[PDB]
Structures are given as structure tokens and as C-alpha cells.
Design a protein around this ligand. Structure first.
Ligand code: HEC
Length: 104
């Protein structure tokens, strides 16, 4: 749960299409503020695939751990183009960082 290595993974691997700050803007991928604790496909103003919208699960560490590994497998037909973070640590790191930054 190194929030400090998580941030690197985020910038190196998510920042292209995503913003985590409040008031932050939708890029290719939506803004992730208020992520934790909300259903999938909830960011306002963004245009979700119907999959991402109907997944209907709640984001929190458990569902993230699972999604980051093969997003396409977690939400088949998701417009997000991203293979997944294979190693568990990275995924905990990156989850540590999002729990933090999408809530601050
Ligand atoms: C651009 C090519 C992306 C990269 C790199 C990452 N994500 Fe993304 N993300 C992208 C899109 C276009 C979408 C919506 C896709 C759809 O089918 O609707 C998403 C969605 C997410 C979500 C969904 C959450 C929700 O509100 O439903 C999450 C939690 C998410 N993305 C996180 C995430 C992380 C942590 C990434 C880095 C490893 C990452 N994404 C990469 C576009 C792109």
C-alpha cells in the first residue's frame, strides 16, 4: 500500500485517460473522484459503454483488485483499452493511491 509507488503507476499507466482530482475533467476515460463507494458508470457527464454502466458493482478495494487485473474480463465490452496490472503488489500500490487521491 505504497501510495507513493501507486502514484507512479497511475501517471505512467492511467493518467493519459484519467483525472482523479475534484473538478478534474473527463479525458478519454472519466474522472475518478468519488470513485470508492459508488456504483460503476456513475461519473456525470461522461459517456459510458452500456457494459460499464450495467456492471452494477460497487468500487472498493476488492472489486478494484479484481478489475485492474483484466478490465476486459471484469466488464466485457468496456471501451477502456488497457490490458491490466498482472502483479498483485502494483495493484495494491495503485489502489492505495486512488483510495487516497480520489477521496482527497
Ligand atoms: C485510456 C486508454 C485509458 C487508460 C490507460 C485507462 N483507462 Fe480507465 N477508463 C477508460 C475508459 C474509456 C473508461 C470507460 C470505459 C467503458 O467501457 O465505459 C474507463 C473506465 C475506468 C474505470 C470505470 C469506473 C467507473 O466509473 O465505472 C475505472 C475504475 C478506471 N477506468 C480506472 C483506470 C485505472 C486505475 C487505470 C490505470 C491503470 C486506467 N483506468 C487506465 C480509459 C482508460
Amino acid at each position: 500500500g505504497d501510495v507513493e509507488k501507486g502514484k507512479k503507476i497511475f501517471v505512467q499507466k492511467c493518467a493519459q485517460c484519467h483525472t482523479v482530482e475534484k473538478g478534474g475533467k473527463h479525458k478519454t476515460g472519466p474522472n475518478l473522484h468519488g470513485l470508492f463507494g459508488r456504483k460503476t458508470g456513475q461519473a456525470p457527464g461522461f459517456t459510458y459503454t452500456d457494459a460499464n454502466k450495467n456492471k452494477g458493482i460497487t468500487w472498493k478495494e476488492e472489486t478494484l483488485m479484481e478489475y485492474l487485473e483484466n478490465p476486459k474480463k471484469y466488464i466485457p465490452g468496456t471501451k477502456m483499452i488497457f490490458a491490466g496490472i498482472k502483479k498483485k503488489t502494483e495493484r495494491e500500490d495503485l489502489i492505495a493511491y486512488l483510495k487516497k487521491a480520489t477521496n482527497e
